[PDB]
Ligand binder design. Structure first.
Ligand code: NA
Lengths: 250, 250, 248
């Protein structure tokens, strides 16, 4: 059956004064991340392996050497038998002030390479229009599970799942206050199942309460099997974040 | 019939955050710091019960961010309680300044590992009994071998093993003089066996001799199979490190 | 096995101005690791078989000033037994601004072949012949697990990023200044690159504006054990010289 075009978001932080990350992210790494979220989008859509057949021309603007939360969004925009066109936007917002500094657009042509006994007959589903989704104040972000983050049993270290949750807590906090934030504490976190190597994590993070200088952020962590689509809630965490100038008023 | 009881050993994992590295600083005193706390817990657990472990849960943790200078950060883990399958591991994260060796932070975390045994005699697996260690009176760090450090034959690149020895050399030298140090030369290093992906490396580094500005450090590298416990000495190296302000009096 | 000429393999890494972590590791343990990695590549290309590092001769290091550097790691085989390969590695650091050579560390690596297969116990390394000295940047890197998907294929994004790195190297060497990416053209991929392979980038300056340069990059894959190469992609990147834009 036909499928609606979902938006997939992948978020990376460049900290103030990190010239290496800055220089690579507004550079080749920036490119790599655009392709990664393209890849994820495609795979979620067709539930089959994909490669990047081609990448359309891209214009880059380098912002000022400040710090940024950088969001990569992907949407499938056209779909053949095996060619998927994916549109990717790269938006950088200052950590301090939340000013949009870049807005690069790329177009990726993914191609499905199906495996299995019935692969001679794989097609992509009819693409239909993405529904305008009633906005959340909640950050929803994905990332792939990398071999370095997994043990030899193929399982993501929970510490590495925790760190992703914290990343999401940093994003939501910082977006809320318009300032740099720092982790002050994290509550008990229980894991319902272990996360596997062939999966994406999805973190959802939003501000629960606001003190004078701190917030409390809830994060929910899901895993999703790329090829099958199987999702499970994995963990819920609560982090306390403090706004900084030295602590500041939120 | 009955696994013999085991003394709770302390496992140490050490990471350097260099002066002015705002990205590492911001992640380490943050989510990455979490992830490392988990990793050293995971090693400790695995050494104890010689079986696969997962993280079932993580108790609340409080964090304090030190000044943006440079730090040697040590993550120690002890098992503190042991059921049939539950292992409680206590982790301490301590950051000392590279310049001056002043303790700036001291966060404690409690990790609840659970064994997931594999094999025919899986259903019958019990954890050993835990005795307390005897608190004893030269640096000793472990780290896991990551896929990115290994070739397609599953063997760690010797270069990567050398780097780890150098990291240990830096830790010892720097602790000794209380200043930042740099590598000046390394001596012939011969490798007795190749290190494999499912193993941890263990470095032991201490100061051999002290010049006016310089210092010699011997490092010994071991590998240890996480599940079996098989250890072998792998390499011995000698690095010269120089104290720096530009060269300084050690 | 017929005799083989000793090729030079080059691996390049950039340390940006002000990156004290990379600086502190690269002029240190990481530098070491890279010298070994390129040695390993050279060996594997020569003998087309698995290799380990049996030993590493003494190395002297000099720390340059905390500025930024393009760092080049070159490896040549220099002696070849039945199973022992001696590889010579040079680590040269040039300033990004000004292109001054600041370091020049030499290392000697003893690789040993560990052949696999049916006629394994009978494997000898092919004979070593000296290459003629050759008359544009070529660089190789291994494809790491983290750059590949669960099907064993390098992400095309990761391929692109390598090409961009090569573009940066060529541009920056050309103008003697720091450069930044301004745009990339359409890039088409001929085949997917696999985990057990190296990528090889060739990059050179095509045309020069006042502040811009356009760089062509060609990407190849090579199977380490078989030697099978294929052209993978060709890209065109525009780079801009910087002080804020500057005169090339
Ligand atoms: Na990695």
């Amino acid at each position: 059956p036909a499928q609606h075009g979902a938006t997939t978001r992948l978020i990376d932080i460049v900290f103030p004064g990190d010239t290496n990350h800055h220089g690579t992210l507004f550079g080749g790494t920036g490119l790599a991340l655009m392709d990664r979220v393209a890849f994820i989008a495609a795979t979620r859509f067709g539930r089959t392996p994909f490669v990047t057949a081609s990448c359309e021309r891209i214009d880059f603007r380098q912002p000022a050497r400040i710090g940024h939360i950088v969001e990569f969004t992907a949407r499938p925009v056209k779909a053949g038998r095996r060619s998927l066109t994916v549109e990717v936007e790269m938006v950088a917002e200052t950590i301090i002030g939340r000013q949009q500094h870049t807005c690069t657009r790329g177009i990726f042509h993914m191609v499905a390479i199906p495996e299995g006994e019935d692969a001679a007959s794989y097609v992509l589903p009819e693409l239909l229009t993405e529904e305008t989704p009633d906005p959340s104040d909640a950050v929803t972000m994905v990332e792939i599970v990398f071999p370095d983050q997994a043990n030899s049993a193929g399982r993501m270290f929970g510490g590495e799942a925790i760190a992703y949750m914290t990343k999401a807590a940093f994003v939501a906090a910082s977006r809320y206050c318009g300032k740099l934030v720092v982790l002050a504490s994290s509550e008990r976190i229980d894991f319902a199942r272990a996360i596997e190597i062939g999966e994406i994590v999805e973190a959802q993070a939003h501000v629960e309460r606001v003190g004078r200088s701190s917030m409390s952020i809830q994060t929910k962590l899901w895993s999703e099997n790329l090829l099958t689509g199987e999702r499970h809630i994995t963990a819920t965490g609560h982090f306390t974040m403090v706004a900084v100038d030295r602590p500041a008023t939120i």
